[PDB]
Amino acid sequence: ARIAGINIPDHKHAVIALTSIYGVGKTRSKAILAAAGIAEDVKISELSEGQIDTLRDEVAKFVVEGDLRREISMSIKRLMDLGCYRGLRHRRGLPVRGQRTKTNARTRKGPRKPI
Contact window for RNA (CB under 7 A) among 3-11, 33-41, 56-64, 88-96: 88-96
Which of 93, 3, 92, 1 has the alpha carbon at shortest distance from 43? 1
- Under the binding rule (CB under 7 A), the answer on residue 49 touching RNA is no
Angle (deg, nearest 10), helices 26-36 and 49-60: 120
CB of 109 to RNA, least distance (A): 14
- Rounded CA-CA distance 13/21 in Å is 14
- Under the binding rule (CB under 7 A), the answer on residue 80 touching RNA is yes
Contact window for RNA (CB under 7 A) among 14-22, 49-57, 58-66, 85-93: 85-93
Cβ proximity to RNA, 26 vs 91, nearer residue? 91
- Burial class (CB within 10 angstroms; exposed 0-12, middle 13-18, buried 19+) of 8: buried
- Under the binding rule (CB under 7 A), the answer on residue 5 touching RNA is no
- Under the binding rule (CB under 7 A), the answer on residue 83 touching RNA is yes
List of residues contacting RNA (CB under 7 A): 80-81, 83, 88, 91-92
